[PDB]
């Protein structure tokens, strides 16, 4: 899934 500070 996506990195924390991405989005």
């Amino acid at each position, epitope marked *: *899934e*996506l*990195d*924390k*500070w*991405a989005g």
Partner: antibody
Amino acid sequence: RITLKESGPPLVKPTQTLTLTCSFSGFSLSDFGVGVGWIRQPPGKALEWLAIIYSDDDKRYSPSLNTRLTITKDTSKNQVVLVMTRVSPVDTATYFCAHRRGPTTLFGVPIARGPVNAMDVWGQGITVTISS
Amino acid sequence: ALQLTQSPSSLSASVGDRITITCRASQGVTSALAWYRQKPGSPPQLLIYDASSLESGVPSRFSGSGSGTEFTLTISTLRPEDFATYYCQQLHFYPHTFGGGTRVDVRR
């Protein structure tokens, strides 16, 4: 100045449980968005990412090792612990913990996320050998 | 999962050369990519974060560019301490993958 250092047993036997401790100074795991991760390196091989934990306590693990890893933090002792169960010989490697910056803030307002894209400070690494 | 392929895996060079190492991702990782240099017996050291930002205290001969699926690290004037192994790391998707590394050694 941020520094981290790994500690734990240099030798461990197959099927046993390995507990590694990362003790650090220069930052707090209560600081905004900070992370501490673990990376390993079998002799002569490439770096392999294992897990990371953030100050808001979100945890993430390598999918290949998920079932054998537990990462936890002890904020008041400035330590992060990684527990690996059921080790086998292929787990022999040098284990490093590392700091990950949280976003830069201005008057406590997040304004830059570029600094989170790297593990910026590393511990010297601790060599662990798995053999019966 | 996401694949990060470094090229070349090994590279020979001499002091003063300009070298460039490249890292390609199987899916786009935006700018969330970091480069490290690791000397024998030591931990990796951060050179470039967020694909192109120069880490504080890192010498200016190191440079990083690219975004998406293709990134490059170039050392403009190789110094003796640069004979080492370099790694790229993606931080857009979990798990936060590392490339296979590229060994830079003394040409002869």
